[PDB]
Design an enzyme around this catalytic site. Sequence first.
Site, PDB file in Angstrom:
ATOM      1  N   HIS A   1     -14.009  60.982  49.494  1.00  0.00           N
ATOM      2  CA  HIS A   1     -15.072  60.382  48.691  1.00  0.00           C
ATOM      3  C   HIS A   1     -15.614  59.123  49.322  1.00  0.00           C
ATOM      4  O   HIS A   1     -15.397  58.043  48.817  1.00  0.00           O
ATOM      5  CB  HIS A   1     -14.534  60.072  47.304  1.00  0.00           C
TER       6      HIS A   1
ATOM      7  N   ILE B   1     -16.568  55.184  49.090  1.00  0.00           N
ATOM      8  CA  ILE B   1     -17.010  54.634  47.818  1.00  0.00           C
ATOM      9  C   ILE B   1     -15.970  54.971  46.764  1.00  0.00           C
ATOM     10  O   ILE B   1     -15.599  56.130  46.610  1.00  0.00           O
ATOM     11  CB  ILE B   1     -18.382  55.254  47.424  1.00  0.00           C
TER      12      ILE B   1
ATOM     13  N   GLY C   1     -16.318  56.433  40.722  1.00  0.00           N
ATOM     14  CA  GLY C   1     -16.493  55.907  39.389  1.00  0.00           C
ATOM     15  C   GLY C   1     -15.414  56.304  38.394  1.00  0.00           C
ATOM     16  O   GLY C   1     -14.984  55.481  37.605  1.00  0.00           O
ATOM     17  N   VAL C   2     -14.983  57.564  38.420  1.00  0.00           N
ATOM     18  CA  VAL C   2     -14.029  58.038  37.427  1.00  0.00           C
ATOM     19  C   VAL C   2     -12.665  57.334  37.559  1.00  0.00           C
ATOM     20  O   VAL C   2     -11.935  57.226  36.571  1.00  0.00           O
ATOM     21  CB  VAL C   2     -13.860  59.557  37.442  1.00  0.00           C
TER      22      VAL C   2
ATOM     23  N   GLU D   1     -10.396  55.023  34.993  1.00  0.00           N
ATOM     24  CA  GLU D   1      -8.959  55.188  34.899  1.00  0.00           C
ATOM     25  C   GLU D   1      -8.204  53.855  35.059  1.00  0.00           C
ATOM     26  O   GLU D   1      -7.197  53.611  34.382  1.00  0.00           O
ATOM     27  CB  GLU D   1      -8.512  56.221  35.957  1.00  0.00           C
TER      28      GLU D   1
HETATM   29  C1  LIG Z   1     -20.641  61.374  40.892  1.00  0.00           C
HETATM   30 AS1  LIG Z   1     -19.447  62.318  42.119  1.00  0.00          AS
HETATM   31  C2  LIG Z   1     -19.173  64.107  41.370  1.00  0.00           C
HETATM   32  O1  LIG Z   1     -20.194  62.473  43.683  1.00  0.00           O
HETATM   33  O2  LIG Z   1     -17.923  61.479  42.256  1.00  0.00           O
HETATM   34  C1  LIG Z   2      -6.065  56.882  31.010  1.00  0.00           C
HETATM   35 AS1  LIG Z   2      -4.262  57.602  31.222  1.00  0.00          AS
HETATM   36  C2  LIG Z   2      -3.726  58.827  29.786  1.00  0.00           C
HETATM   37  O1  LIG Z   2      -4.129  58.436  32.752  1.00  0.00           O
HETATM   38  O2  LIG Z   2      -3.226  56.210  31.110  1.00  0.00           O
HETATM   39 CL   LIG Z   3     -18.785  58.264  41.871  1.00  0.00          CL
END
Ligand SMILES: C[As](C)(=O)[O-]
Ligand SMILES: C[As](C)(=O)[O-]
Ligand SMILES: [Cl-]
Lengths: 142, 132
Positions: free
Chosen positions: B49, B55, B58-59, B63
């Site tokens: 990524h 980069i 975002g996800v 987290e």
């Molecule tokens: C917004 As993405 C699916 O390139 O991490």
């Molecule tokens: C946001 As979690 C359930 O991986 O601590």
């Molecule tokens: Cl992203």
Amino acid sequence: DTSIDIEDIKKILPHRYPFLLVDKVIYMQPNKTIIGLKQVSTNEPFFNGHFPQKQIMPGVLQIEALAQLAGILCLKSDNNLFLFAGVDGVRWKKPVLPGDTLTMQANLISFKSSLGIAKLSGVGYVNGKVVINISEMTFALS
Amino acid sequence: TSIDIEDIKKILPHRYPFLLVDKVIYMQPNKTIIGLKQVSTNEPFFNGHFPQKQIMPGVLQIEALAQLAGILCLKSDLFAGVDGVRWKKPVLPGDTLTMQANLISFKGIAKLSGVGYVNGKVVINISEMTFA
Ligand SMILES: C[As](C)(=O)[O-]
Ligand SMILES: C[As](C)(=O)[O-]
Ligand SMILES: [Cl-]
Ligand SMILES: [Cl-]
């Protein structure tokens, strides 16, 4: 047929191990919708960290797999680097576990050529039942 | 108070490669928590990524803020929902991601706000993380 295998997904998406989370596209209709899957295995690097005593696919990676499927549809509808700009209304319904097939559908809401912004909804299923809903994923093309 | 990684690991069950809080700077129970995540090229997800532009996904910023929120909950005593996430600017190798989560509600459900900064400037906002 409309299905797409991993080698061709790789020609579409920039994502690579350990952050490519679409194994197969089973259906796609350009500018409309896409259906694919992610196979969930104990043999995936994240499972050792989430969690040692209980393997549960992270909810944020379920967003990521829906996002990537969604990005396939955008690129095949119209720079392959799309970044997450926003996400609303994510509800996780049930844990995703090793042994599961995560089936996913993303539906296109809008895509702006001009501005490089796309919005899509997403739903993930296991065994025909909803495990994740996403009201709206927004992507900017960086 | 402040919390180092060994103590963070005594609170959270998360382990490599999915522990995304490096330090807690400050914590007021039932209120707020401030911590940070150091972003290095030497993290496993960067090869993917992306090969040609590193980069932080975002996800994984969601987290990190969710894990930070998890600590504040555990010390005020899964991830069920998230809403109103806005990413402002990319987080890159060499950045420090400073994070603050605020408790909004504890009712069996907890709701928290989240903000991430790089050099004082917002890189991500989360209006609502929902836990149960
Ligand atoms: C917004 As993405 C699916 O390139 O991490
Ligand atoms: C946001 As979690 C359930 O991986 O601590
Ligand atoms: Cl992203
Ligand atoms: Cl989770």
